[PDB]
Design a protein around this nucleic acid. Structure first.
Ligand SMILES: O=C(NCc1ccc(F)cc1F)c1c(O)c2c(CO)ccnc2n(O)c1=O
Ligand SMILES: O=C(NCc1ccc(F)cc1F)c1c(O)c2c(CO)ccnc2n(O)c1=O
Ligand SMILES: [Mg+2]
Ligand SMILES: [Mg+2]
Ligand SMILES: [Mg+2]
Ligand SMILES: [Mg+2]
Ligand SMILES: [Zn+2]
Ligand SMILES: [Zn+2]
Lengths: 182, 367, 367, 182
DNA sequence: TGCGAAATTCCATGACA
DNA sequence: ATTGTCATGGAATTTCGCA
DNA sequence: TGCGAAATTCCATGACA
DNA sequence: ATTGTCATGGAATTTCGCA
């Protein structure tokens, strides 16, 4: 069988609704199944329109062979199906109520939901400006299985922003109190 | 006067050939030369004569001498002519150069992607969705290009676009010309906060940004072809052109900017499938060798009458936007340091240190 | 399809080398080539494949082929690629030429003064006494120049100035570019009433008026030098510059425009006195021989990749003032007649006959 | 002695006052003593100002060594003297009431006064437009003494406007009647 | 009949929007 | 139905002054 | 071991305001 | 303290298919 490659499969999902940050409420998460590279796009709704608008930016850089998602409404619409067919993208859906991706993708999506929470506390309405530095952190995180960061697997080079200092990724006792109040 | 006195009686004076009869007529010392009879003016009058002949039409060496030779003769006339040309400030700053610049440098391609970005603005363009300009960001090593439409070539629009770009990776160095958007203190602070070194071209020398400028040509050429027979709605075409050019083969390289960046094509038409059986680690290994073996051009031969800068030499910087009927060259200045055969530091006409390209310099004539 | 059918069983077909194993897989005829396994599409599908590869970024020969070669192979692929390039209207009218024009002609100097005038306007200049433009009239044989300040590059101002000039002599031919002042029917009637033939440069080719254009440079250069450190009051300087340039030596000719016109200097500084003992008849005799022995340059060597026009060839005229994101070249047209190696008549894109210089032409690529 | 040459001596004089033609009343006549070449400049007065203004046009083409005139006020003024001294022109005046030039110049000035009269009749207020064609006629008139026209002696070439047809230069009987009425 | 230096010629360079 | 041109100053070449 | 033709490489040309 | 670049299509060169 052919070895797994970048752009073979993109895993997409929505995170939200979130506190409004400059008008945006959701984050469309795109993860490459082979490298673990992550793209974060802020949208104003989990709609096909906002999904096509954000994926048009991504597909102007690289086009995946397959897009995998759950049976979310924005992804099972006939409009999004026509959008994927025009670009030669095969849509692949997980079973309803049985979300299935891959171990590397599952853990990657875990890190994103946890990293977003750790920085949402204290600045719940400023996460729009933080999305760039969040992507850099996620894509420069060392992978214990592959022993390479997503940046290294996608570009074949080291990065100018290595993240040697790891955030606790767990909420400190003071961050838990300031979160239960929100 | 005393020198001309001993010449009339027949005594020899160095510079005046002996085989000619020097006589006096109408109170002026004359000589019978093959071209005719010429007046030999005293040494104290020769500077004023050269000046009056030059000032007629501010002519160069030969045209000024042909005037003087109609009436006068004295030893080494051109020596006195050239002496005045080098002192005439109007000629020094208005005349054109007749010496070409030395051959261009072909600086080494950046070794890795994101080692050096080149950025520049295209515009103004026909209004499309309210947008007039395009921010063009080219990775020096790969040629991979990002396009961002803006309403103005402003620092604010530049920062907003680069914050989106740097979501994927942070570059070591960003190179740009000295436009207002890139030289503002706001842009320098933005780059320092992210550990990005800002590199600037020498003023008024777009060749130094030739990486993007050349890419600007391909962007406009493709946009033109796609807009033939249609109204110039280019806003919706920028993502199309960005993808098309990033996946276009360079015939001399045998690779596309996308392949040099990722080592593998994505789900685009006619995607290359050669490395299909290799693993990603084997694929990246082959990519690391492809990047190091890329063709690199060499410096072309120098033209037959080129000049190279020397420390201490008198050079003149070209005037940026010369007004009508105004000199094209600044007053002479001195070369302080030679950074490379094509770039120098000069003591500017205002008293400052200035880093300029020799394409905007001429060597001051007549030393 | 039928051609590919006999290939799978092992029968030979011209163009397909025998030493390769042609097999079938997934309903497509494939071949094991050194670069890898490629799909051999049927003949009826190859035009559509070349079009889809080209249309990605409207790329030239090699860049379009490198795309197709990633997936397909068939005999003489570039032949089909070039066939599509020559039919793509967008590429033909947007791409640049890579063939330079043939070497320039050095037309013979007019034999006599007033045989041919060259005229052109300089401007707009800084307002001086209400005047903005300068009419420049250069005698082709002598280089003698008349200057006339005008408020507009208009036919009325041109006629008023030339009526004053023609008080001294009437020229055989007046050469000008195709500006509005010289192409108006009013100006043609003015010239016909006086027996003057009007000659026009090919459009958008100031080299054809290079006689005046070069003189325009000397006029501006002198005006600049005289106005250094002063406000640009150039109206009172036009007579000064006219006299100064008319009495300036040409170093290659060894004469001034005044001397070539009159055969004797007037009461100007440094006036030549060589012909002082000759009579006027002997002086004019010497002048008649000086005019015929003047240096004349020859056609330079052609560049290594130049093109010369041939009757019936497909050429394209450059667009005069191309708008933003619009093609730089008109649709292809046919050469009707070759007036000289640098000038042709074409069947214009509107249906008219047009006389153009090859500097504003490119030969249509791919025949 | 040195042979006579063009630009050796210019002979100047005023003709007028004339009927007003586009605001001008006088004609400053300049004749080169050697070639007989004639320049005609219309002025609004026989003043030094109008003389300097018209001679500045001529001296921007060629500068004579000597200018000869009568003791007219415009030519004996200190202003006109300063003007000539700046250009290196030597002023030379004829004796008062004893106008003296040369035979070729005397006859040339005769032709000008007669040719102006022949075309003044019928169109007395349109001579301004006719000054160009008048100069061409005068400068392309065959000289019986030198056997060359002024144009040929000044430029050393034949002219593109040879005047083979000679005007009678005398007033026809009908032109005399239409002149005695004016 | 040849030398060193001055004088002359050569010509690449650039600018005429 | 029309077409490049020429001032400029270092460099290359020729000429000059003298023997 | 060499031929004719196809394939590849070479590179002058021009345009990025 | 900084530096030209590269798509393009005929032409020149190399390689291919075959013997
Ligand atoms: O003249 C420009 N290009 C033309 C150009 C010329 C030669 C070359 F090899 C590449 C080129 F592109 C140009 C500018 O003059 C400019 C200025 C100054 O006005 C400020 C900011 N950007 C600028 N860009 O981007 C430009 O391209
Ligand atoms: O571009 C012009 N010159 C520039 C120029 C370029 C090359 C050259 F070898 C000589 C030159 F002078 C130019 C014009 O384009 C023009 C036009 C068209 O706009 C109409 C009327 N006159 C014009 N003159 O006089 C011009 O000089
Ligand atoms: Mg720029
Ligand atoms: Mg630019
Ligand atoms: Mg013009
Ligand atoms: Mg012009
Ligand atoms: Zn000067
Ligand atoms: Zn095309």
């Amino acid at each position: 069988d052919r070895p797994q490659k970048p752009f073979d499969k993109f895993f997409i999902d929505y995170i939200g609704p979130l506190p409004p940050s400059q008008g945006y409420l959701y984050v469309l998460v795109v993860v490459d199944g082979m490298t673990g590279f992550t793209w974060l796009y802020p949208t104003k709704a989990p709609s096909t329109s906002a999904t096509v608008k954000s994926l048009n930016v991504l597909t102007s850089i690289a086009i995946p062979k397959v897009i995998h998602s759950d049976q979310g409404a924005a992804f099972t619409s006939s409009t999004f199906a026509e959008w994927a067919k025009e670009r030669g993208i095969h849509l692949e859906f997980s079973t309803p109520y049985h979300p299935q991706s891959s171990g590397k993708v599952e853990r990657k999506n875990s890190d994103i939901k946890r990293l977003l929470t750790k920085l949402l506390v204290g600045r719940p309405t400023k996460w729009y400006d933080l999305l760039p530095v969040v992507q850099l952190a996620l894509n420069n995180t060392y992978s214990p299985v592959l022993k390479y960061t997503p940046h290294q697997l996608l570009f074949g080079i080291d990065s100018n922003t290595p993240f040697a200092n790891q955030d606790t990724l767990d909420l400190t006792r003071e961050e838990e109190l300031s979160l239960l109040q929100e | 006067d005393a020198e001309l006195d001993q010449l009339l009686q027949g005594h020899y004076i160095k510079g005046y050939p002996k085989q000619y009869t020097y006589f006096l007529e109408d109170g002026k010392v004359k000589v019978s030369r093959p071209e005719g009879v010429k007046i030999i003016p005293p040494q104290s009058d020769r500077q004023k004569i050269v000046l009056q002949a030059h000032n007629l039409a501010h002519t160069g060496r030969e045209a000024t001498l042909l005037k003087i030779a109609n009436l006068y003769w004295w030893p080494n006339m051109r020596k006195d002519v050239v002496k005045q040309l080098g002192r005439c400030q109007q000629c020094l700053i208005t005349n054109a150069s007749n010496k070409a610049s030395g051959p261009i440098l072909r600086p080494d391609r950046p070794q890795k992607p994101f080692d050096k970005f080149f950025i520049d603005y295209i515009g103004p363009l026909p209004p499309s969705q309210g947008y007039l300009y395009v921010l063009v960001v080219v990775d020096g090593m790969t040629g991979f290009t990002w396009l961002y439409p803006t309403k103005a070539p402003s620092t604010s629009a530049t920062v907003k676009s680069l914050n989106v770009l740097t979501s994927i990776a942070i570059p070591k160095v960003i190179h740009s010309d000295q436009g207002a958007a890139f030289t503002s203190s706001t842009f320098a602070e933005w780059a320092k906060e992210r550990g990005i070194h800002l590199e600037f071209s020498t003023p008024y020398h777009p060749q130094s940004s030739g990486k993007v400028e050349r890419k600007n040509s391909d962007i406009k050429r493709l946009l033109t072809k796609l807009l033939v027979g249609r109204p110039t709605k280019w806003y919706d075409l920028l993502p199309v052109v960005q993808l098309a050019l990033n996946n276009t083969y360079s015939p001399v390289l045998k690779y596309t900017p996308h392949q040099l960046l990722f080592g593998i094509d994505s789900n685009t038409p006619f995607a290359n499938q050669d490395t299909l059986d290799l693993t990603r680690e084997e694929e990246l290994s082959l990519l690391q060798e492809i990047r190091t073996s890329l063709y690199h051009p060499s410096t072309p031969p120098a033209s037959s009458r080129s000049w190279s800068p020397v420390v201490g030499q008198l050079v003149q910087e070209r005037v940026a936007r010369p007004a009508s009927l105004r000199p094209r060259w600044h007053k002479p200045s001195t070369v302080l340091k030679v950074l490379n055969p094509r770039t120098v530091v000069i003591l500017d006409h205002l008293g400052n240190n200035r880093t300029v390209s020799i394409d905007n310099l001429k060597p001051t004539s007549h030393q």
